[PDB]
Design a protein around this ligand. Structure first.
Ligand code: NAP
Ligand code: NAP
Ligand code: AKG
Ligand code: CA
Ligand code: CA
Lengths: 413, 413
């Protein structure tokens, strides 16, 4: 027992506005005093990204790839309002798009549950983790309105000599609408891999949802590639570990989500993931009670972040000297979930114990009535909430620092 | 004072198995003792359809078109198993789909709430009525698997012999998947007309969900057709009733559902209607507490039925001595909602009155503690259920029948 000292290192992406502020409080108060982790720092503030012609962002991604883990603070993505504000050379791409592109992989969203902060769904006791496919179906599609009266025909034209195959879709008298969409086995397969690695690392069962009763070929491909991946590479490791993989109908699975206790990973196609993730987010509680984790298809590499933005509104108050009650636990959990993968890879059970301890201590802090404004709101209603009911960001972080201390001291020699 | 009568006519489709039993019982007990109604009968028992080549189903559907109101009991659909049970004829199409094709219009599903039967979603205080488009999109699409390299290409081919449009969807390098789908302006427009009329007849606001952020042309059309129709034909009448029409992104809208108290109509595209209805089914409680109402686009013709099927496993159970406690209120509410529409068309206030009474009364009875097995388990759980806690089918129907005598009676001296 001394500062922990992991073998491998963590890649830290600093961000902007309110999250950078609390990110600093989190490091100084909750992490570095109790753990001795080697960091590789990269500053993804909007200033340094412009200054460097968005180069930090690329080198942050590659450093994540070499080290295997990265925590990442929320980051402003440029629009036209922000080019004027920050005086930007060009409208730089969203750092999340940039990093994902480079790393590849699939985002999984994990909520954080306390007993005293109720969910909107009375059955939910464990987390339901959605993993979204996120490489095109309707998101890479080609649509057009039909104004004339004509016929919609699909074609596949082999790259070799082979004969065209032509599909007669429909015949328009009055107007209408037409669409085409695609996916690739390479993307489906890599999605399945991330899901399987994710489920195995979390020791949770995995479900895939499709609508292969109606899209027999299109969704049947989804179902088949997952079944190929399971049998070949994962069934055994899953059985050993007390978990399983199952394909279900999207209809079945949204009812299962309503009905069930939770405790599973749920693989969703692009669209379903978009739609159902909003539903689940709402159901579980505040945006400050969920993290996003990108896992690569080999399962070796991981980027973790809070499932919210930089919370600009609360940054406008911080700048104007007002005290602020932004919920920090998504950010703190991003650090524990990051360090947990580090420890797991490195086989550093000591560090693992720290992440568990910290997460556990946060959950108790809230359960004893010490929480931020958003969470008081959930419990007591949008009104019945006075300043005394909640803590501000930093005195909340201090309240868990105090509770981490008690717990942190242990086995003193 | 003796009975209540109406000039207009009610079509009745009678069905089969357990629902057919219940159907008979609620007529004799709850509606005929208080109502003289013109009523044209069609028998949709699986035998009578086989016997009559499925023509009674097409006759029943056209009679509802003529008269404006039908009540339907659940019907067996043909599988390979079902041909042998009754007598083999042919693999006959489902009655619902034939009636739905004949009538046009959109089905709207309405849950029945009581204060003492909790929903899985804490926020739901009012019904959220999903109306599902039910033509096109994924359910009449053309999909296939790509195994060679080559090119996915869409062509629109004007019927006049004009210049065809060629879209260039994707060059596959490894295998993958392809899909083409359509909808028509006519169908989207008729769907829009049902939604505006249904929501107006019920005095609820109306939401459309699309993903027009991504399918700018495909989903944009749904948005544009709804908008242009609201401005032209409905906005005045909605403002006059104190309701509104609003387009929402499908992500925002499923989130809205989770946190809203309800009291609105929700227009869903085919797929979204399919998926989100099952989510709602599980959320609102028993399948015996929800009706379906098909409303044609002119707003004048309605077909109403229970949301569940024939209840086969209560029927095989049925009367081998073995009694049952099937929930009949979805079946009862099918009559009240039909008769309500009958009255509203007729300007027959005394019949409208009667529909409201029997509804209020059924709710009151269940809030009293008299309810079928299904509802008893909801209040708390399979283990704590004994027969002290609930009533059988005939007994519950009688319990409301006696409670109904006292209601109508509040005519005084
Ligand atoms: N990972 C990322 O890099 C990421 C993701 C999303 C958005 N963003 C960026 O963040 C900036 C702001 O975008 P946005 O306002 O749309 O998203 P946001 O930062 O999540 O803020 C939206 C609102 O959600 C509530 N909220 C969010 N986090 C909270 C917390 N920890 N505790 C309590 N309440 C919280 C606040 O509502 P009230 O003000 O009503 O309290 C807040 O104003 C943009 O520049 C956007 O591009 C970044
Ligand atoms: N046209 C229609 O309206 C329609 C719709 C769907 C299905 N069907 C047809 O009906 C037949 C059987 O359908 P199915 O077994 O798939 O669904 P179902 O008849 O609705 O029965 C499904 C199960 O749900 C429970 N349940 C359903 N309704 C109930 C009620 N009113 N009260 C209490 N419990 C209820 C029962 O389980 P417990 O006994 O364990 O409670 C029942 O076995 C099939 O031939 C099918 O094609 C017709
Ligand atoms: O297919 C649908 O849209 C509804 C299911 C149904 O009731 C039927 O088709 O018989
Ligand atoms: Ca979304
Ligand atoms: Ca369904």
């Amino acid at each position: 027992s001394n500062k922990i000292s992991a073998t491998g290192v963590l890649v830290e992406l600093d961000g902007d506005e309110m999250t950078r502020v609390i990110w600093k409080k989190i490091k100084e108060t909750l992490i570095f005093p109790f753990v001795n982790v080697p960091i590789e720092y990269y500053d993804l503030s909007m200033e340094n990204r412009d200054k460097t012609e968005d180069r930090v962002t690329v080198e942050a991604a590659y450093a994540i790839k070499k080290h295997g883990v990265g925590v990442k603070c929320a980051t402003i993505t440029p629009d036209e309002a922000r080019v004027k504000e920050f005086n930007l050379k060009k409208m730089w791409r969203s750092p999340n798009g940039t990093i994902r592109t480079i790393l590849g992989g699939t985002v999984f969203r994990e909520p954080i549950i306390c007993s005293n902060v109720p969910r909107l769904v009375t059955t939910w006791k464990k987390p339901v983790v959605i993993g979204r496919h996120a490489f095109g179906d309707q998101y890479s599609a080609t649509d057009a309105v039909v104004k004339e009266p004509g016929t919609f025909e699909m074609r596949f034209i082999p790259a070799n000599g082979g004969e065209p195959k032509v599909y007669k879709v429909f015949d328009y008298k009055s107007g209408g609408v037409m669409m085409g969409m695609y996916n690739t086995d390479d993307s489906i397969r890599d999605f399945a891999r991330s899901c399987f690695e994710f489920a195995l690392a979390r020791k949770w069962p995995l479900y895939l949802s499709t609508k292969n009763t109606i899209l027999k070929h299109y969704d049947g491909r989804f179902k088949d590639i997952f079944a190929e991946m399971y049998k070949a590479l994962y069934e055994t490791k899953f059985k050993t570990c007390g978990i399983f993989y199952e394909h279900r109908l999207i209809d079945d699975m949204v009812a299962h989500c309503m009905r069930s206790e939770g405790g599973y990973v749920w693989a969703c196609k692009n669209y379903d993931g978009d739609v159902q993730s909003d539903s689940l987010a709402q159901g579980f509680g505040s945006l400050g009670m969920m993290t996003s984790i990108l896992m690569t298809p080999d399962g070796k590499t991981v980027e973790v972040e809070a499932a919210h933005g930089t919370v600009t509104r609360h940054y406008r108050d911080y700048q104007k000297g007002k005290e602020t009650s932004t919920n920090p636990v998504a950010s703190i959990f991003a650090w524990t979930r990051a360090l947990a993968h580090r420890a797991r890879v490195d086989n550093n059970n000591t560090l693992l114990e720290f992440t568990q301890r910290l997460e556990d201590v946060i959950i108790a802090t809230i359960e004893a009535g010490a929480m931020t404004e958003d969470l008081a709101i959930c419990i007591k209603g949008e009104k019945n909430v006075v300043r005394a009911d909640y803590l501000n960001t930093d005195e909340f972080i201090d309240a868990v620092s105090q509770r981490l201390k008690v717990a942190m001291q242990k086995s003193k020699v």
